[PDB]
């Protein structure tokens, strides 16, 4: 097999060994694409994912590499953003970004603040009861969002009753 | 049904053999946080007395009130860092590289060592600095020793030598600091390292009791009821099961008990002074009278009167330091009666 991805005019993608870096106006993202017998290369204008095998496991990865790369293209140009909405019922939940990590205070009356460290060059801009996670690296971003939502996870009581927490509102 | 019960004694202090060096050897040092400094000091145990203090604990419903504390007195006269030893990182751990010695030696340091008569301080210092440049310099420590002669109650004069790590800011900054200390005469004091109110880990070789039975050596029961009248009183039921057909080392047996090294963690330094204020009337039993640089350590301290004990800034404290505790009274009443 062999797939060819024509890189966007806005982007530049270079690669040495198993590492691929994509750079655009929005930034740069590097990724390790390592899988048995799958060669990835920057052919001037196009990125080529090729292998000599065709068994399901390979094709499986090939497809994974593809989307992975395209997501990079998108990230360095348009970028990636996740929308989130803080929500509480009795205790006013206070979400602030302090340093390289978002902090949630007074969650369910909790004296102890809840926090998580942001991943990579992800921007977590908070405006009122709305959050916006953005960055050129979908992996980082996607996780930063997810962590934030996970951070208000609750197991001890009924969730249908205790719904406080921050949630992903819009997925890229 | 046979009730459960925890095994007798711990398997964390073994083998339970006599110690190699009557002088303690820390196997862990504090973290390199603050400024450059020697991470240890020593002295000779003297005895015990209590002291009244002001509840210092902020979380105590008694903070501010009187409180009698048991304190062990320790004569901590000055010591002398006679040399700076350097270690290099290697595929097989840390290894001593060279050493920087001095010329000014205590009149009686030759009762233990073969004091240097010809030593090249600078080549050594160079070798080290070239190691650091290459970045193969491992931590740095000072060969130190005590001055038993300074302590009348202690019969020995032959000094007790021991290496102690120097932790500081940058390696370069503490390397220098070390050299400065050594170069002088190596002379330093408990004040230069500790401050009353701080916590310290006190090492030392416990009191020896020769061979003892399992009952005392491991805390196993004595024979009870009628079993105690039959010819067995302080022997354990059995050395094990039929199979495996061998006696497992984990079974409590007779042996050398005491005279083991013990590093007692988080001891609070109640006060570092000098003079004869802590000394008791009649004289500390089997020791003598104190009157010079001393330390007051809260609680107990391993080892018997006259044994060399070693201090180190706690490596795993639990509380925050509450400096210089107010001492309203120190009992000087006779330890006899």
């Amino acid at each position: 097999p062999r797939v060819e991805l024509e890189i966007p005019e806005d982007v530049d993608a270079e690669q040495d060994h198993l590492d691929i870096t994509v750079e655009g106006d929005n930034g740069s993202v590097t990724r390790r694409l390592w899988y048995p017998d799958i060669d990835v290369s920057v052919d001037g204008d196009t990125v080529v994912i090729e292998s000599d095998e065709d068994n399901a496991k390979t094709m499986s990865t090939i497809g994974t590499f593809q989307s992975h790369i395209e997501n990079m293209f998108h990230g360095v140009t348009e970028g990636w953003e996740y929308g989130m909405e803080v929500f509480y019922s009795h205790f006013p939940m206070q979400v602030n970004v302090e340093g390289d990590e978002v902090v949630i205070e007074n969650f369910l009356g909790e004296k102890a603040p809840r926090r998580t460290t942001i991943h990579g060059d992800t921007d977590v801009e908070i405006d009122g009861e709305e959050l916006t996670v953005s960055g050129p690296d979908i992996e980082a971003v996607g996780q930063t969002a997810a962590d934030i939502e996970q951070l208000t996870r609750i197991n001890d009581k009924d969730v249908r009753v205790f719904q406080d927490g921050v949630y992903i509102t819009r997925k890229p | 049904p046979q009730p459960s019960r925890p095994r007798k004694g711990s398997l964390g202090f073994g083998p339970r053999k006599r110690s190699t060096s009557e002088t303690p050897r820390f196997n862990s040092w504090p973290s390199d946080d603050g400024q450059p400094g020697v991470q240890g000091f020593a002295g000779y145990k003297a005895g015990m007395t209590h002291v009244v203090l002001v509840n210092d604990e902020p979380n105590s419903p008694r903070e501010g009130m009187e409180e009698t504390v048991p304190v062990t007195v320790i004569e901590t006269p000055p010591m002398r860092a006679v040399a700076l030893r350097a270690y290099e990182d290697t595929p097989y751990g840390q290894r001593p590289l060279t050493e920087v010695w001095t010329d000014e030696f205590h009149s009686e340091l030759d009762r233990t060592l073969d004091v240097p008569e010809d030593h090249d301080p600078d080549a050594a210092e160079e070798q080290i600095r070239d190691a650091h440049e290459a970045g193969d310099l491992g931590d740095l420590r000072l060969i130190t020793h005590t001055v038993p002669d300074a302590v009348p109650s202690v019969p020995k004069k032959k000094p007790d030598v021991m290496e102690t790590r120097v932790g500081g800011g940058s390696v370069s900054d503490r390397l220098d600091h070390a050299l400065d200390i050594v170069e002088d005469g190596g002379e330093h004091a408990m004040n230069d390292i500790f401050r009353a109110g701080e916590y310290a880990d006190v090492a030392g070789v416990t009191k020896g009791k020769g061979t003892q039975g399992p009952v005392k050596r491991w805390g196993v029961q004595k024979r009870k009821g009628k079993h105690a009248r039959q010819g067995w009183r302080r022997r354990i039921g059995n050395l094990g099961p039929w199979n495996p057909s061998r006696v497992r080392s984990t079974v409590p047996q007779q042996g050398q008990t005491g005279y083991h090294q013990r590093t007692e963690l988080n001891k609070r330094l109640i006060d570092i002074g000098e003079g004869d204020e802590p000394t008791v009337d009649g004289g500390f039993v089997n020791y003598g009278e104190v009157d010079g640089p001393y330390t007051l350590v809260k609680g107990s301290v391993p080892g018997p009167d006259k044994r060399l004990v070693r201090f180190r800034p706690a490596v795993r404290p639990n509380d925050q330091p509450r400096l210089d505790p107010e001492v309203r009274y120190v009992s000087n009443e006779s330890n006899q009666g």
Partner: protein
């Protein structure tokens, strides 16, 4: 320190056992050998299982004892001992005239024995001796 190795072998990206097999065969022919860059040797397999075996070996034991290395250093050497009749005179000789090192303390670059090399390009299920050691709890002195 100083070892007149008639042969210096580089284990980096080489299948431990396939190296050990040949290193034994040679030492028994009277060859003094030195294995270099142990920490970079590899063994194929599902990492998780592989570590369970080695970890089990560290835990095995009794009063009589079962001393198993944790450093990629010994690991390799014990692997080689297993291929020599180390309790016979001949064997102990062949085993003693062999030495494994972390990295390379020599000037020369070791050679790579035929059929012991692993292509990282067409291989993802394998582990580094060093990796194994870090799990066992060794002190990454390399």
């Amino acid at each position: 320190a100083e070892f007149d190795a008639d042969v210096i072998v580089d284990a980096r990206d080489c299948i431990m056992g396939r190296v050990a097999s040949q290193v034994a065969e040679q030492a028994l022919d009277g060859e003094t050998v030195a294995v270099v860059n142990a920490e970079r040797a590899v063994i194929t397999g599902r990492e998780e299982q592989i570590v369970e075996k080695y970890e089990k070996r560290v835990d095995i034991g009794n009063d009589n004892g079962y001393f198993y290395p944790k450093r990629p250093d010994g690991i390799f050497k014990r692997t080689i001992r297993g291929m020599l009749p180390h309790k016979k005179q001949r064997g102990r000789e062949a085993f003693e005239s062999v030495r494994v090192y972390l990295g390379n303390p020599y000037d020369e670059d070791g050679e790579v024995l035929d059929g012991t090399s692993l292509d990282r390009l067409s291989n993802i299920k394998f582990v580094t001796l060093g990796e194994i050691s870090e799990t066992l709890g060794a002190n990454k002195t390399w």
